[PDB]
Amino acid sequence: SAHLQWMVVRNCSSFLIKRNKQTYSTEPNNLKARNSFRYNGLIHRKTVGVEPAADGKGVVVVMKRRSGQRKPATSYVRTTINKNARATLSSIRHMIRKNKYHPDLRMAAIRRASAILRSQKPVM
Amino acid sequence: WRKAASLKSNYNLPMHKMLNTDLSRILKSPEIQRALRAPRKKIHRRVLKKNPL
Amino acid sequence: NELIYKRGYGKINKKRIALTDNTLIARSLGKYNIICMEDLIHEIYTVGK
Amino acid sequence: AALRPLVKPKIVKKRTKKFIRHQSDRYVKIKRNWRKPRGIDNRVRRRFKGQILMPNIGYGSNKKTKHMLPSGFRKFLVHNVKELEVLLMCNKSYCAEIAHNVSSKNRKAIVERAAQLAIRVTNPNARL
Amino acid sequence: WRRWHRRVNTTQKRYAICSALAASALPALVMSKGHRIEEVPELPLVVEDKVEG
Amino acid sequence: ACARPLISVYSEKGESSGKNVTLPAVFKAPIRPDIVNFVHTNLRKNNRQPYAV
Amino acid sequence: GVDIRHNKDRKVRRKEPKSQDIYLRLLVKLYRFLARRTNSTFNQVVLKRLFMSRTNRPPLSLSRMIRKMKLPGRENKTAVVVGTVTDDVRVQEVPKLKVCALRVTSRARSRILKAGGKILTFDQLALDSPKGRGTVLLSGPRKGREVYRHFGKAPGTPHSHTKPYVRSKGRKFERARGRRASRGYKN
Amino acid sequence: PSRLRKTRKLRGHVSHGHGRIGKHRKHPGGRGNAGGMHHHRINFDKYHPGYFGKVGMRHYHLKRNQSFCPTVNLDKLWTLVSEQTRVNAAKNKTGAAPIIDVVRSGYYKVLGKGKLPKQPVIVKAKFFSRRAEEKIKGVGGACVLVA
RNA sequence: AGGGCGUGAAACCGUUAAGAGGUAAACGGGUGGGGUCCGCGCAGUCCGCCCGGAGGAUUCAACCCGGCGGCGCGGUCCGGC
RNA sequence: UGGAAUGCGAGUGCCUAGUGGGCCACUUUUGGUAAGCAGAACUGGCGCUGCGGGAUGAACCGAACGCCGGGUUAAGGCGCC
RNA sequence: GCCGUCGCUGGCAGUCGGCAGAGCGAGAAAGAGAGUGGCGCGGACGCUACGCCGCGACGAGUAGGAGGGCCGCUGCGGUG
Ligand SMILES: [Mg+2]
Ligand SMILES: [Mg+2]
Ligand SMILES: [Mg+2]
Ligand SMILES: [Mg+2]
Ligand SMILES: [Mg+2]
Ligand SMILES: [Mg+2]
Ligand SMILES: [Mg+2]
Ligand SMILES: [Mg+2]
Ligand SMILES: [Mg+2]
Ligand SMILES: [Mg+2]
Ligand SMILES: [Mg+2]
Ligand SMILES: [Mg+2]
Ligand SMILES: [Mg+2]
Ligand SMILES: [Mg+2]
Ligand SMILES: [Mg+2]
Ligand SMILES: [Mg+2]
Ligand SMILES: [Mg+2]
Ligand SMILES: [Mg+2]
Ligand SMILES: [Mg+2]
Ligand SMILES: [Mg+2]
Ligand SMILES: [Mg+2]
Ligand SMILES: [Mg+2]
Ligand SMILES: [Mg+2]
Ligand SMILES: [Mg+2]
Structure with a gap:
């Protein structure tokens, strides 16, 4: 279960990183990257990830489907959103709210999908 | 847990100290949610003491 | 008066809580019909039951 | 073009000088690192007047501004590019400090990334 | 003659084996040890017997 | 828990064959990292060789 | 300065279990929630007992659970234990019992289930009756440990039936001087 | 672990x-x-009373297997046979009484401490106790001896 | 790295630079003076919204097709496990 | 009507280091001409303890200590240091 | 004002959101209970629960004890 394998992963993971009085986590689908039960991207039954698109532009969104749970290959679904800065932040918002899909992660997903758009504009 | 080990002499898998290890589903379950006092989620920080005189 | 008002703190829950409102005296000494800082002053001055 | 923090509070420190060791001045074998003097007749651990001071717990820093550099940022050792994305959602409160060993070929492609990610680097002109 | 070797209860070595097998069928407890199994089709990865050939 | 799924054997070409095997009950035993560690840090003291001046 | 004494300022109760197992540290999470969020002083006792060491929550015997659940009035109740429910081979008839313990030995699961009783867990109990209504808290004998026979007044002392620490017990192992009224004295 | x-x-x-100081x-x-009688006497008398002196008779060539006699109590007597032997005598109606051979389990003497279930038995044993034999008569049963 | 030659610390010494000097020196608290470098200081933060002001897109809503995913007390749909 | 007042959460169990050279003071006090002497009682100290005062000071008077700002005191003081 | 210890065996799984209704500081044991008859698709943070938050009181110390060290040294199994 989630709380069970979290009580195993909370301190002896391999993504856990502990230096300078901070403790982040390098899980694939951990958004805010911080080591917590709520934001861990491997423990839960339904997670959310917001990575940058493989090319220059766009933001990929990685939902974890329910049916396939012990099948890592066919477990995650991915959708590249290469749109303006606002429609993508209303699509992630709908993807999470209207689906009622892990709804406490929405503002985290928008805050990350904005960091990506900001880190993909032309620098100054 | 019902059929013993055949290749070992007498061994059965260790029993479980708790079965439903998902205390999220346990905690937001109508069985338990009804038997709780309302949450006291207001923060009452120290009130500065002015002088009634 | 000067003492109860300016330096008046109540031993609530074994915590020195400053008496800022009458609902701190009523909540504890209420069962003795002492419900305000005035009933408190009257109980102290006129040594009561 | 400085990368400002989220909020820049006032940093107050209860003491600035180091805590030198008793009699670290008459000798060279006695380093400056602190050692609580435990001798019987010692004048420092009796807290005499005008003597050296002792690291009490009273000197602790405000937890709100503890470990916080004078740039209003906390810090993080970064050994390679991949350890920045860990820091990209803590942008306006933590900074990066590329390690001492990361060669200049990698440190250039680390400051390069942290520029896009708007992460602040404390030693961005380090090696070159 | 320092005590180099330790002995463990058999039922406890078996508890540890069953706990080290029950934890190898969880994508989180395997992807957290570091293994790169993002594309393994199923965790209790079984293959036909011809593999021994 | 109690529900033991049906894992599917994978042919040597990667594609899933027709054979299925019911998840053995060992893969539901309790995960006890403390027992696993206590057993590991004692059993690997045994393969150690003496040394002394 | 104030003239108080800090000899006893630090209350020594257990704030949490010393064990590191995760099927106990999850029960303690669920019951710490029930303990603080309900007004039932049952959960508070279960929580305070989940901290206790392995010597403070001792085993129960099936027979002592029989005679403590046969007392008049407490029928159709669930016998809660925090330790383990060992077997008691010197009892022949077993009734049906609803039980909830941390462990039940593999020869007491047999007897209880063949009788027809239920064997719940602490999470099943917490779902059945959150506030713990219909339960019977029990705990095995604490002075049962052989350790508690050496405690008390030291041996060799008037009317101190305390067991001494001896390598072996025999004719010539502490039977000569402080025990015989003949050789010296006795207490 | 240092x-x-x-x-x-x-x-x-x-x-x-x-x-x-010290x-x-x-x-x-x-x-x-050292000093069991001189300067550690309060300890050798407060905690090990009877440590000094002789008592009893010696026995030179003691062999610990002439005096071998492990006992079993009546409470756990019915645990030597299988379960379908105690319940088969319950369902039984011809009064037959199962033979519990104790020296076959590894005990010589039978002491009578516990209660017994109401059914007959035939306890073969080497040595019997008075009460262990009375608790068996009072339930109906025979105390066979085996040399 | 120059034949006891990898790195080459400390005590001790030489010379150069800077300051200082009659209560042995050193020391803790407090400031001030001068130096050394640093900030790559020297016209000083950005961010969201809205209003207006000038421009540029192959662009919004709504419909149609295809795929994907969530949910379903599909009161109680089919077949599985 | 929990049978005086005032105050304060108590009870119990194991395991246990260091100590077993002490000294000073008010008052009582034994030996001694007496002693910064030898020896007891009660309480408080020094030892284990800084700080303000007594110029100085183990023990006297005040007062007991986390690191800081303002205010006021104790015991001592206020020609100058 | 700040740091820390102790106590409250304190609070927080209620982030219960168009399957919504946003509360449990208030002197007075207990339900913002059920039934039965007279447009605009929007809402910060949190929760490494070994975590986070709120309240008061406290802070000397030799010999000695205990705890916490994301203090440090060298090697081993893992892991970056
Ligand atoms: Mg000296
Ligand atoms: Mg001294
Ligand atoms: Mg104080
Ligand atoms: Mg103290
Ligand atoms: Mg203590
Ligand atoms: Mg010594
Ligand atoms: Mg000694
Ligand atoms: Mg020794
Ligand atoms: Mg003598
Ligand atoms: Mg060289
Ligand atoms: Mg070389
Ligand atoms: Mg050289
Ligand atoms: Mg010069
Ligand atoms: Mg010691
Ligand atoms: Mg001595
Ligand atoms: Mg004297
Ligand atoms: Mg001394
Ligand atoms: Mg003292
Ligand atoms: Mg003093
Ligand atoms: Mg004088
Ligand atoms: Mg002051
Ligand atoms: Mg003067
Ligand atoms: Mg202290
Ligand atoms: Mg010490």
């Missing part, structure tokens, strides 16, 4: 946990059980 021990927090304190000398009381 890193957990107490000599790792005792680095920097002069006496190493052992006293400034040092940690080598043997300030003698070695071993």
Whole structure:
């Protein structure tokens, strides 16, 4: 279960990183990257990830489907959103709210999908 | 847990100290949610003491 | 008066809580019909039951 | 073009000088690192007047501004590019400090990334 | 003659084996040890017997 | 828990064959990292060789 | 300065279990929630007992659970234990019992289930009756440990039936001087 | 594990946990059980009473297997046979009485402590106790001896 | 790295630079003076919204097709496990 | 009507280091001409303890200590240091 | 004002959101209970629960004890 394998992963993971009085986590689908039960991207039954698109532009969104749970290959679904800065932040918002899909992660997903758009504009 | 080990002499898998290890589903379950006092989620920080005189 | 008002703190829950409102005296000494800082002053001055 | 923090509070420190060791001045074998003097007749651990001071717990820093550099940022050792994305959602409160060993070929492609990610680097002109 | 070797209860070595097998069928407890199994089709990865050939 | 799924054997070409095997009950035993560690840090003291001046 | 004494300022109760197992540290999470969020002083006792060491929550015997659940009035109740429910081979008839313990030995699961009783867990109990209504808290004998026979007044002392620490017990192992009224004295 | 021990927090304190006034000398009381009668008498009398002297008869060539006699109590007597032997006598109606052979389980003497279930038995044993035999008659049953 | 030659610390010494000097020196608290470098200081933060002001897109809503995913007390749909 | 007042959460169990050279003071006090002497009682100290005062000071008077700002005191003081 | 210890065996799984209704500081044991008859698709942070938050009181110390060290040294199994 989630709380069970979290009580195993909370301190002896391999993504856990502990230096300078901070403790982040390098899980694939951990958004805010911080080591917590709520934001861990491997423990839960339904997670959310917001990575940058493989090319220059766009933001990929990685939902974890329910049916396939012990099948890592066919477990995650991915959708590249290469749109303006606002429609993508209303699509992630709908993807999470209207689906009622892990709804406490929405503002985290928008805050990350904005960091990506900001880190993909032309620098100054 | 019902059929013993055949290749070992007498061994059965260790029993479980708790079965439903998902205390999220346990905690937001109508069985338990009804038997709780309302949450006291207001923060009452120290009130500065002015002088009634 | 000067003492109860300016330096008046109540031993609530074994915590020195400053008496800022009458609902701190009523909540504890209420069962003795002492419900305000005035009933408190009257109980102290006129040594009561 | 400085990368400002989220909020820049006032940093107050209860003491600035180091805590030198008793009699670290008459000798060279006695380093400056602190050692609580435990001798019987010692004048420092009796807290005499005008003597050296002792690291009490009273000197602790405000937890709100503890470990916080004078740039209003906390810090993080970064050994390679991949350890920045860990820091990209803590942008306006933590900074990066590329390690001492990361060669200049990698440190250039680390400051390069942290520029896009708007992460602040404390030693961005380090090696070159 | 320092005590180099330790002995463990058999039922406890078996508890540890069953706990080290029950934890190898969880994508989180395997992807957290570091293994790169993002594309393994199923965790209790079984293959036909011809593999021994 | 109690529900033991049906894992599917994978042919040597990667594609899933027709054979299925019911998840053995060992893969539901309790995960006890403390027992696993206590057993590991004692059993690997045994393969150690003496040394002394 | 104030003239108080800090000899006893630090209350020594257990704030949490010393064990590191995760099927106990999850029960303690669920019951710490029930303990603080309900007004039932049952959960508070279960929580305070989940901290206790392995010597403070001792085993129960099936027979002592029989005679403590046969007392008049407490029928159709669930016998809660925090330790383990060992077997008691010197009892022949077993009734049906609803039980909830941390462990039940593999020869007491047999007897209880063949009788027809239920064997719940602490999470099943917490779902059945959150506030713990219909339960019977029990705990095995604490002075049962052989350790508690050496405690008390030291041996060799008037009317101190305390067991001494001896390598072996025999004719010539502490039977000569402080025990015989003949050789010296006795207490 | 030295890193957990107490000599790792005792680095920097002069006496190493052992006293400034009274040092940690080598043997300030003698070695071993010395002074059992002179200067450790309060301890050898408060905690090991009867440690000094003789009592009883000697027995030179004692062999611990002439006096071998392990006992079993009546409470756990019915645990020597299988379960379908105690319940088969319950369902039984022809009054037959199962033969519990004790020396076959590994006990010689039968002591009678516990209660018994109401059914007949035939207890074969080497030595019997008076009460162990009365608790068997009072339930109906025979106490066979086996040399 | 120059034949006891990898790195080459400390005590001790030489010379150069800077300051200082009659209560041995050193020391803790407090400031001030001068130096050394640093900030790559020297016209000083950005961010969201809205209003207006000038421009540029192959662009919004709504419909149609295809795929994907969530949910379903599909009161109680089919077949599985 | 929990049978005086005032105050305060108590009870119990194991395991246990260091100590077993002490010294000073008010008052009582034994030996001694007496002693910064030898010896007891009660309480408080020094030892284990800084700080303000007594110029200085183990023990006297005040007062007991986390690191800081303002205010006021104790015991001592206020020609100058 | 700040740091820390102790106590409250304190509070927080209620982030219960167009399957929504946003509360449990208030002197007075207990339900913002059920039934039965007279447009605009929007809402910060949190929760490494070994975590986070709120309240008061406290802070000397030799010999000695205990705890916490994301203090440090060298090697081993893992892992970056
Ligand atoms: Mg000296
Ligand atoms: Mg001294
Ligand atoms: Mg104080
Ligand atoms: Mg103290
Ligand atoms: Mg204590
Ligand atoms: Mg010490
Ligand atoms: Mg010494
Ligand atoms: Mg010691
Ligand atoms: Mg000694
Ligand atoms: Mg010794
Ligand atoms: Mg003698
Ligand atoms: Mg060289
Ligand atoms: Mg070389
Ligand atoms: Mg050289
Ligand atoms: Mg010069
Ligand atoms: Mg001595
Ligand atoms: Mg004298
Ligand atoms: Mg001394
Ligand atoms: Mg003292
Ligand atoms: Mg003093
Ligand atoms: Mg004088
Ligand atoms: Mg002041
Ligand atoms: Mg003067
Ligand atoms: Mg202290």
